[PDB]
Amino acid sequence: LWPWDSVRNNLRSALTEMCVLYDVLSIVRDKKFMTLDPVSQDALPPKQNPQTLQLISKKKSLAGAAQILLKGAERLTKSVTDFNSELLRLRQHWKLRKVGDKILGDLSYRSAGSLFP
Amino acid sequence: RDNLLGISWVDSSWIPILNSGSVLDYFSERSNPFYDRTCNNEVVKMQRLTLEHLNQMVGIEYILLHAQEPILFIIRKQQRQSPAQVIPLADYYIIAGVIYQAPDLGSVINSRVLTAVHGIQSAFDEAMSYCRYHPSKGYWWHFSSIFQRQRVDALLLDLRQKFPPKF
Amino acid sequence: REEKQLEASLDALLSQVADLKNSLGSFICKLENEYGRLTWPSVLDSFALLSGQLNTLNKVLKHEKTPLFRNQVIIPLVLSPDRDEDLMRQTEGRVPVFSHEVVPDHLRTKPDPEVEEQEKQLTTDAARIGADAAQKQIQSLNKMCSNLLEKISKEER
Amino acid sequence: SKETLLQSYNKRLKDDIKSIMDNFTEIIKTAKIEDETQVSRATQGEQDNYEMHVRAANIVRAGESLMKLVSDLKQFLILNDFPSVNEAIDQ
């Protein structure tokens, strides 16, 4: 598994941290070993950063989006300009059928009169 | 101040002294970034009469709530708009003489989901580069019997049945 | 009264938590046990399920119709310097001796520094032209976004 | 038989069409920019970038599936087309 081990690192590390998250929540369902107590608090805004940054979600990640859409589009536009062509000439001279999932033809003079089995 | 929850303030000078009042004393020695200088607890402390003056004058005063003997000791604020009216602002607790502001249950969720989302996004963006597609080849990554065994098999059986292995 | 709905929301969120954790563990084990012939479809599918449902479910089970979690004062009772069966069956084979290394590991709040630098560049990108274009561009983009969705949804009748 | 294969083709076509349309509608669903509340800005920003990335990937996969369907239709018609076969035979 020498390839995809780096993704494996990032995911097992994210796995251990979210295991620590299920751990803190496992102590959050707890009233033994630890008590809950609610009192609120405040956090003044610096800006209207949800919107502002969301617009960057469009800039940044819709640029990644549009990039990948245009990248698929350039790959395909290149790709279109060979199997299915050859099948035409073959089907034009010889005799073919499809049974199961493969493609099978005949050689025998059998539709033309012979009975040689 | 902006992210004081991660900052740790320690001082080995007052480690040997540790009792009920030593928690309040160590928290309020001098110039603690966690301990506000202009707090009303000073006004009670320097002169005398550390018993009742916390509830008398207007201010935010520090009282313990839970105290387990070896290490952990909890410090609570009360903003005193009126006597017998308790509202807290921030949460403190010391473990082995190390002061910590107790976080909420919201911002810790924020930090953990931030780390998780960053890790998963990084893994996905790294995994994007490996796949290549072509309409003819498909997807990939960069990095017979002549029906006479119905006889030869019988001979082998007749051979095995007549010549057992000697091991 | 707040405590009852707090506990119900608690159990809902931990149910979706257990779902997400099983998702991640199953994805890792499937990657390993099935490194036979794996393909880009199945992994894009796995990511989509992980993203779409777990993300949107937890996000709406948090920020609507809830007692407020950003209240809670977090104050454990004691230190348990020894191996309790409470831990090993409460947590399914984890949680070593609860101590002064895992008191902050539990109660850590400072994130990694890369997002801190990101916030520094958030201050930087707020240092550009503002207070006349933030709200103005919210208005414009909101309006034309809404017009777009209206037009595209309108014609399927 | 032959009814099952053709109805499978119909199912694949309608599934992929509704999938791409639904994906674009959800892209415009998350496209409304609003004010935040208790959502921890950077987290949902990063994961919405992640969601639009995986949704663009879904769009590309939908296009590739349509290409595969077109190729299969091309194979099917040539092989079983009685009228086309006859013309070649008579020439």
DSSP string computed for C78-92: ----S--HHHHHHTT
> How far is Cα D21 from Cα D4, in angstroms, rounded to an integer?
26
On whether the CB atoms of residues B23 and B40 are closer than 8 A, the answer is no
The minimum CA-CA distance between B126 and chain D, rounded to whole Å, is 13
SS3 C111: coil
On whether the CB atoms of residues C22 and C46 are closer than 8 A, the answer is no
> How far is Cα A99 from Cα D80, in angstroms, rounded to an integer?
12
Asked whether the beta carbons of residue D38 and residue C63 sit closer than 8 angstroms, the reply is yes
- Tokens in use for C123? 């201050």
- Residue C59, Cβ density class (10 Å: 0-12 exposed, 13-18 middle, ≥19 buried): middle
> How far is Cα A62 from Cα D31, in angstroms, rounded to an integer?
10
> How far is Cα B166 from Cα B90, in angstroms, rounded to an integer?
86
On whether the CB atoms of residues C106 and B102 are closer than 8 A, the answer is no
Please report how many Cα atoms fall inside a 13 Å half-sphere around the Cα of residue D14, on the Cβ side. 6
Nearest to A93 by CA among A101, A105, A84: A105
Set of chain A residues whose Cβ sits within 8 Å of the Cβ of B133: 75
Q: Which residues does residue A98 pair with via DSSP β-bridges, in sequence order?
A: A103
**Residue numbers of D between 53 and 82 with CB closer than 8 Å to C:** 54, 57-58, 61
- Residue D61, Cβ density class (10 Å: 0-12 exposed, 13-18 middle, ≥19 buried): buried
In eight-state DSSP terms, residue B103 is P
SS3 B74: strand
On whether the CB atoms of residues B42 and B57 are closer than 8 A, the answer is no
Residues 6+ apart with CB under 8 A from C79: B68, B70, B71, B72, B95, C98, C99, C100, C103
DSSP tally for chain C: helices H, then strands E: 7, 1
SS3 D68: helix
Resolution in A: 3.7
- Tokens in use for B86? 């308790």
- Tokens in use for D34? 């609003």
> How far is Cα A13 from Cα A6, in angstroms, rounded to an integer?
11
Where helices occur in chain B by DSSP H, the ranges are 20-27, 41-47, 53-56, 107-128, 149-160
From the list B71, B115, B124, which residue is nearest C79 (CB)? Answer: B71
Asked whether the beta carbons of residue C63 and residue D54 sit closer than 8 angstroms, the reply is no
In this structure, are strands B98-101 and B91-95 parallel, antiparallel, or unpaired? antiparallel
**Residue numbers of A between 49 and 108 with CB closer than 8 Å to D:** 49-51, 53-58, 60-62, 64-65, 68-69, 72, 76, 84, 87-88, 91-92, 96-98, 103
- Tokens in use for B89? 């602002």
> How far is Cα C106 from Cα A25, in angstroms, rounded to an integer?
10
Asked whether the beta carbons of residue A91 and residue D79 sit closer than 8 angstroms, the reply is yes
Nearest to C28 by CA among C43, C15, C45, C49: C43
* Neighbouring subunits of D (3+ Cβ pairs under 8 A): A, B, C
Q: Please state the φ and ψ torsions of residue A100, each to the nearest 5 degrees.
A: 70, -110
The minimum CA-CA distance between C10 and chain D, rounded to whole Å, is 17
Asked whether the beta carbons of residue D55 and residue A56 sit closer than 8 angstroms, the reply is no
> How far is Cα D17 from Cα D14, in angstroms, rounded to an integer?
5
The b/e string for B112-130 (b: 16+ C-beta within 10 A; e otherwise) is bbbbbbbbbbbbbeebeee
Residues 6+ apart with CB under 8 A from A112: none
On whether the CB atoms of residues C114 and C121 are closer than 8 A, the answer is no
Any D CB within 8 A of B120 CB: yes
Residues 6+ apart with CB under 8 A from A84: D71, D74, D75, D78
> How far is Cα A111 from Cα A93, in angstroms, rounded to an integer?
14
> How far is Cα D65 from Cα D70, in angstroms, rounded to an integer?
9
In eight-state DSSP terms, residue B9 is B
Nearest to B62 by CA among B24, B26, B25: B24
> How far is Cα A30 from Cα A110, in angstroms, rounded to an integer?
83
Technique used = cryo-EM
SS3 A75: helix
Interface test with D, best of B3, B104, B108, B110 (most D CBs within 10 A): B110
SS3 A42: coil
The b/e string for C128-146 (b: 16+ C-beta within 10 A; e otherwise) is eeeeeebeeebeebeeebe
Q: Which residue's structure tokens are 């990657």?
A: C31
Set of chain D residues whose Cβ sits within 8 Å of the Cβ of A88: 78
> How far is Cα B53 from Cα B67, in angstroms, rounded to an integer?
22
Any A CB within 8 A of D71 CB: yes
In eight-state DSSP terms, residue C156 is T
- Tokens in use for C125? 């990108």
The minimum CA-CA distance between C17 and chain A, rounded to whole Å, is 7
Set of chain B residues whose Cβ sits within 8 Å of the Cβ of C112: 115, 118
Asked whether the beta carbons of residue C152 and residue D50 sit closer than 8 angstroms, the reply is no
Collect contacts of C129-137 with beta carbons under 8 A, ≥24 apart: C130/A47, C134/A47, C134/A48, C134/A51, C134/A52, C135/A48, C137/A55
Where helices occur in C34-133 by DSSP H, the ranges are 40-49, 56-60, 85-90, 102-106, 113-126
The minimum CA-CA distance between C98 and chain B, rounded to whole Å, is 12
- Residue C106, Cβ density class (10 Å: 0-12 exposed, 13-18 middle, ≥19 buried): middle
Q: What is the dihedral of CA C111, C112, C113, C115, to 10 degrees?
A: -70
* Cα three-residue angle C85-C90-C96, rounded to 5 degrees: 60
Within 10 angstroms of residue A85's Cβ, the number of other Cβ atoms is 8
